[PDB]
Design a protein around this ligand. Structure first.
Ligand SMILES: *C/C=C1/C(=C/c2[nH]c(/C=C3[NH+]=C(/C=C4\NC(=O)C(C=C)=C4C)C(C)=C\3CCC(=O)O)c(CCC(=O)O)c2C)NC(=O)[C@H]1C
Ligand SMILES: *C/C=C1/C(=C/c2[nH]c(/C=C3[NH+]=C(/C=C4\NC(=O)C(C=C)=C4C)C(C)=C\3CCC(=O)O)c(CCC(=O)O)c2C)NC(=O)[C@H]1C
Lengths: 313, 313
């Protein structure tokens, strides 16, 4: 069971009490994007990240309380129809928007209960990157080859300095069973780590929401304002949002290992977390949203490939 | 065993001898695109579709014999490295090019032996269209729901007037086991058709090359010039090229049914052709290349979903 978050009086996290960090409701996002929350019926913007004006151009009073119909006239109908009430919180609506700064602005929306959650992030491969990846994965003759091709493909698509396939045992310990990495990196292949390293609430979350990342492992989180959802007077659930602030405890872990940027995709087999495609980069790194989607798609393929090959082997 | 094609003295196809039509080497393409073939080592353009100048702007003598290095300076290195000798003929290199006509020009390249085959077609959704489709497919509780969600998803992505899941029995007859269609269309759900309707050489081809289409079921094919590959003095294999001319026999079948446009993706399970996602539209229709890729990706997911669910059921 969760502690309250730090902003509701909850205690600071330590190595004893880390299984109980409410990692899904940090009340803050990562600084490479902005986030808004809005009413699912009326489209009124209820919360905003304090950096919203940097990405959107409007002010924290000009936005807060306004309707998405007024803010995003072209997207609102399509968005509302894509994410109707009662839908899965994993369902997403994505669109590209123009802004005064060069390039585009990616918008990704999901719904959790009565709330819509809108994530904005800059954008400046595709479906065909994946399509060649599928062939690679499909022709692999055994699980070892599959695991290897999987990590080699992901690294080719992403440029990540380390890409690992991390498989869980029934006791929640994990083993790096395949690894693609930059020449000269110290190898993690075959190493096992304790269950505590990806604690129980994280694993549970990773079964429902299949991709998470830390763009910059020393970047300070940007709070949401107001911190609590006015609909509920409870914390906003950020589990389905990639801009969700990462556990400081995990960021510390990453920095200690010399990791500037991190990303993992879940491999989920029979509704169980089977393992992770776990990636590191030496520097801060923002993976473009369309590459992330591709990775999610690859995770679901690998999950099925694994399920099939494990049944035959 | 195949007849020679019509341009090597082979006989015209009839309802008796249709299992033997060399559908993989028509020596011609569909008119909504252009095609070139080039040497895999030197990049010299060896064959061209007679309509090449319409899509490329150069003349049939200015192109024929020129190197891709000279014609596509930006793509040639990446292309050559993506498709090295000995690779699978299903592997593809895709890029977008600019041209004097509005919009882009899509280039798709594959290699068969010593030959590179370049397909050019106009372009004026994505990876995230697929990503929501995967969720739909994944949550289906049984094969019937899977089949239905599959056809409903494909139709949503494509707008096709009829989308069918067509499952083969061991005798090569097929049954439409799920169907999404425009309101008021006559239903094919549950109907069985004879093995002759998708003859043996077609099924064999569909096991290796997983998507084919007829953009316009009364459009006349555009020949390749020279018709034979100068490397081999034999026909050019067009099995891996979507612009490949469709069997006139099949086009006739389509027109008789009132189908202006057709597309199917293979569902391949344990190296066997399990069925097809088979689509019709009332009018001529060019599906954008990035939507086609997405469909291919969906076919490979459905194949795995089917394999897993059939093992459990
Ligand atoms: C006392 C708490 C601890 C702790 C908490 C923690 N860890 C995560 C998330 C992850 N931990 C991961 C572990 C590894 N990455 C590696 O490279 C290796 C080994 C080579 C390991 C064992 C991983 C992969 C994750 C997933 C996130 C990612 O991909 O970066 C969380 C949850 C983070 C979040 O989602 O906010 C938490 C709370 N880890 C510990 O080691 C102890 C100190
Ligand atoms: C004597 C030869 C015949 C013949 C040849 C033929 N058929 C195909 C390809 C296809 N036939 C298909 C059959 C159907 N489409 C449907 O909608 C239904 C039923 C509702 C059926 C039975 C299909 C789906 C294909 C795949 C191509 C596509 O998706 O359009 C070929 C090969 C075409 C090519 O790839 O060039 C050939 C040679 N069909 C006959 O009925 C007899 C006359």
């Amino acid at each position: 069971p969760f502690f309250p978050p730090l902003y509701l009086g909850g205690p600071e996290i330590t190595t004893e009490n880390c299984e109980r960090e409410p990692i899904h409701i940090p009340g803050s996002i990562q600084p490479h994007g902005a986030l808004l929350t809005a009413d699912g019926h009326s489209g009124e913007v209820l919360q905003m990240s304090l950096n919203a004006a940097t990405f959107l151009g409007q002010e924290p009073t000009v936005l807060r309380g306004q309707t998405l119909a007024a803010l995003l006239p072209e997207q609102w109908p399509a968005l509302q129809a894509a994410l109707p009430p009662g839908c899965p919180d994993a369902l997403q609506y994505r669109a590209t928007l123009d802004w005064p700064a060069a390039g585009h602005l990616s918008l990704t929306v999901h719904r959790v209960g009565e709330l819509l959650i809108l994530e904005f992030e800059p954008t400046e491969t595709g479906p065909h990157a994946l399509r060649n990846a599928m062939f690679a994965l499909e022709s692999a003759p055994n699980l070892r080859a599959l695991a290897e091709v999987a990590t080699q493909t992901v690294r080719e698509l992403t440029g990540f300095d380390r890409v690992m396939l991390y498989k869980f045992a029934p006791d929640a310990t994990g083993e790096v069973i395949a690894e693609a990495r930059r020449e000269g990196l110290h190898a993690f292949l075959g190493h096992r780590f304790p269950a505590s390293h990806i604690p129980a609430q994280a694993r549970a979350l990773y079964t429902r929401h299949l991709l998470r990342l830390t763009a910059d492992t020393r970047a300070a989180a940007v709070p949401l304002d107001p911190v609590l959802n006015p609909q509920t007077n409870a914390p906003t659930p950020l589990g389905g949002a990639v801009l969700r602030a990462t556990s400081p405890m995990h960021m510390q872990y990453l920095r200690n290992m010399g990791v500037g940027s991190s990303l993992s995709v879940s491999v989920v087999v029979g509704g169980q977390l089977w393992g992770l495609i776990a990636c590191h980069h030496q520097t801060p790194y923002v993976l473009p949203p369309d590459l992330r989607t591709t990775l999610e798609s690859l995770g679901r393929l690998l999950s099925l490939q694994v399920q099939v090959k494990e049944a035959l082997e």
